[PDB]
Subunit: 318 residues, 4 copies
């Protein structure tokens, strides 16, 4: 029995017995993602080169912004591309707050590296006029989150209370087909992912942990290394193959580099729903209470046994 993102979303919405807003929000998001995917695969680039005789990041941001606003399901929108939280005009306001990164990893897009869209959805908790404050909720309050990976193929990973489901975009009919239901990450993996070019500035715990992956003190097989440089790609591989992903804090960056609202929380949410873990080293990413919409946060996530092991090393240096 084939299932599509539209059908899946509509059914979960029916079960929730609500107003149908989140359904419309998700449908709009879905449409924006297919539009971003089309642009990422360079549809029509021939016209840009004169066959008939301006940035992907900005276009992606416009697509999400416009689709979400026109869904009438949102009131506050926080994007990695905008300095201030966007406030939806009164006549199009819904009860949801959305934090997102329209095109994650679009800084190296010149090498055709995988890129993606990350998003986190919250329910406005206060009756106050919508403001940036409404997006300052701990990831623990997420109602839904996920990402779209524009890699060899386009996939949308959607996480909610019912679990994590993966949909593959069929370009022939512009439909997201459900190919992986209630996904669970491997208990322990064999791959570690992080930019080792920062070795010199690594925190001692990170240095020792990576050293244990390369030189297992018990002489077991060393972990393999992978680092794409695009969070959505690295996190998705971690979910699919298991293992651990790190973008830790150091003396020069006490809070890390990745952003909490639209990068860390969404991925941490997907991880926990899949039976994985996501920590900053001091606490679970989802429990961090934000004070600034663009605040950074250190993050170590992936297979539970792997994160637990990291925390063990971290505790030793604490």
């Amino acid at each position: 029995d084939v299932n599509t993102l539209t059908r899946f979303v509509m059914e979960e919405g029916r079960k929730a017995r609500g107003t149908g807003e989140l359904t419309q929000l998700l449908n709009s998001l879905c449409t924006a993602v297919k539009a971003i995917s089309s642009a990422v695969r360079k549809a029509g680039i021939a016209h840009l080169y004169g066959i008939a005789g301006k940035k992907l990041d900005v276009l992606s941001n416009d697509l999400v912004m416009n689709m979400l606003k026109s869904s009438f399901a949102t009131c506050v929108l926080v994007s990695e591309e905008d300095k201030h939280a966007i406030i939806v005009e009164p006549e199009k306001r819904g009860k949801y707050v959305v934090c997102f990164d329209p095109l994650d990893g679009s800084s190296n897009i010149d090498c055709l590296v995988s890129v993606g869209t990350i998003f986190g959805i919250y329910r406005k908790k206060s009756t106050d006029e919508p403001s940036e404050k409404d997006a300052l909720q701990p990831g623990r309050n997420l109602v839904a989150a996920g990402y779209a990976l524009y890699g060899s193929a386009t996939m949308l990973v959607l996480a909610m209370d019912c679990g994590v489901n993966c949909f593959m975009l069929d370009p022939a009919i512009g439909e997201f087909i459900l190919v992986d239901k209630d996904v669970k990450i491997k208990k322990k993996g064999k791959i570690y992912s992080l930019n080792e070019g920062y070795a010199k500035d690594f925190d001692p715990a990170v240095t020792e942990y990576i050293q244990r992956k390369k030189f297992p003190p018990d002489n077991s097989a060393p972990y393999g290394a992978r680092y794409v440089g695009s969070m959505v790609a690295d996190v998705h591989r971690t979910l699919v193959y298991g293992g651990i992903f790190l973008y830790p804090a150091n003396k020069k960056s006490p809070n890390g580099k990745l952003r909490l609202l639209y990068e860390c929380n969404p991925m941490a949410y997907v991880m926990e729903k899949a039976g994985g873990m996501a920590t900053t080293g001091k606490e679970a990413v989802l429990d961090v209470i934000p004070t600034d919409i663009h605040q950074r946060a250190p993050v170590i996530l992936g297979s539970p046994d792997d994160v637990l092991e990291f925390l063990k090393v971290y505790e030793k240096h604490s």
Copy 2:
């Protein structure tokens, strides 16, 4: 003035004043690539999931094999998928020998990591009946080589005596548009790429070189690290951003891990034509004389200054 792969190839062929065979071979390869790209982006996956009530690597291999045979321009075909060299039937034999990897990186495709097609084209040298021996030529004899990267977007990099040219596939019209003419790699980069999970087994020279990238002895800025795990993706980033890529021998791969005929030689050829370098440590990849179609070869390639620097360290440990 727009230019397409078809137009470009046809023009270069006209200038060569030959039989037009290589033109037909390249046109056929081009068609196979677009077909592979369509399958990689999962066109029609909905039918596989029951919307109406073969493995990618095998399909890709079939596409290349069939298009090349039907081009009447080849006589011996070596592929990563087949144990023995395929010999084209007499009535479809041409004078070219093609070595290729239909879908490079298709092993970690579950995570939607970038994948690609690598190829190297040789002119049959010996006059004996076509056999596997015709594919045992040093990369120095290549007439043309390149790859197709199926990443955020699909691009075909084609290298010939005239240089390296990059074409972007416009999915809207199924046409490869020329977007980068006579490409040259940066003299020196700031990124090193290799699987550091093998640290324990690294040869001393590799260990020291990597150490110099992380802890510059001249206290300059440390290089950044990237490792996708897919050769076409890692090599393409190296070409575009500069830097160095390594897959040196391991103690469990005394002769390196990558294959000489359809992975190393093609990439080394593209690098040299772009002003870059490609060495095994002992000699230029292109000068190695193969004795077996699937033999492995160590490889260090990328920006000249970076490779030269590695060779300096290598020589110190020799």
Copy 3:
């Protein structure tokens, strides 16, 4: 503010405050149409011709059948492709009955003539076991109807109580974009459409009417003639440009040739919702009470002034 078929359908469904079934049915129908469109435009035909070394009407029928069944919104399905009404298995039954022609005009498909999908949706009006009898309702009971035209471009015309809306399929993202809201047909047109090859067998009223279009009584300019041979194409042109379409009953087809349940009623419903008319000559198509799911019905539809004029001629010969 852009609007999509999905968004539109979901909103009208929310306002109806029902179970959401019709929403699920329409979404499923939408997905089936995009799949049919992809196959009609011949996606993948290259594989059929050996690039790598079922009939369209059957496939189309399977797509609609499977999507509708899996929607859990239907119970009785009538298709021009199946002699007997299909009864949905108990575990997938919904309250709707759907009559449709999977691929109208697929008989003359070899000439690439426009083809389409016609559908009519009824609410099961009985409390007993679903049977063919549930599809024998007069078009007057339709809850929704429309068609998909696979012409120069693909468009879905959907008619409901709120009116007629036209959606254009954007192939790049597989999304139906609303381009024409609350469409109304011209009061009077300048085009008449019917197969004049049947002149010899025409009913005197039809003969006189056509005669008035060619040799105008009020010395007005003669109407232009157009006859594609595909109902969806001819009817759509009528809706867009106005005028009249005819497929009357001659001497051997006293009951016409087109089918009442999945050709005539749906188009008649779209016409009336657009301010147009649809008559059999004796009564409004929508008022005919069917006794056989495949019974034929004569039909004259289009601009009101044009149909009224035909009826005037018809009455003179009655």
Copy 4:
């Protein structure tokens, strides 16, 4: 063994042992057609409607063909419906071919999503002097190649040359024209007649009688069926595939017909003759008419031989 437009064209070009220009011209035309098809199927129309918060199709199509042909370095004179005057390719991009074309035939009624197409005719410049409009004034008999692209239920490119007529289907998944019908030949006699009967009042007596014979066969055989899309490429293609006859004759108001000789009539007449069919103006074969104006009109009756011959019989009776 699969074959594509590119492969086919490259092979025929190799056999001709020429400069390769026509190959580049055809490759360029092929690319332009795929781009036109993409636009006709409305790719990206969502952006036109604000999904992210514009020129006419006929104009775009004309630009695509013009630009691709110029950039092919194989042409010198280009005649299209869009520009009143023949376009002269700048010296640095001049080739030896002359191309007459209709970028988007039937785009006057593209609102109803009716089938549309691109028609083209290719000539070799037969003068040594400076390229001018005069080089496009050759009888269709001189055509080196001609054909059309039909943007209907699916997109197909029909290419006619000395070797015959070949039909290629565009596979949108890979942007490749796949050869699906080799050396096509039209049926000797068909059962369908096509023309705008709304002009009955102004029909020439011969046309009136001929149509009368199709509807009321004298020997009481089965009457012909009628089809009229209103788009020449669609009507002509159906004629080629199913056989029969297509007419757009001269009448009271239009003594020289309505269709254009250089980029509508000649190309279709050439495809018909190469397929074993016929194309007459009533007085002579369309291909033999010597044009004096690049946009001159010409009456046309084409299709299955037996059907055209029969028309000519009626025509001669009224002459």
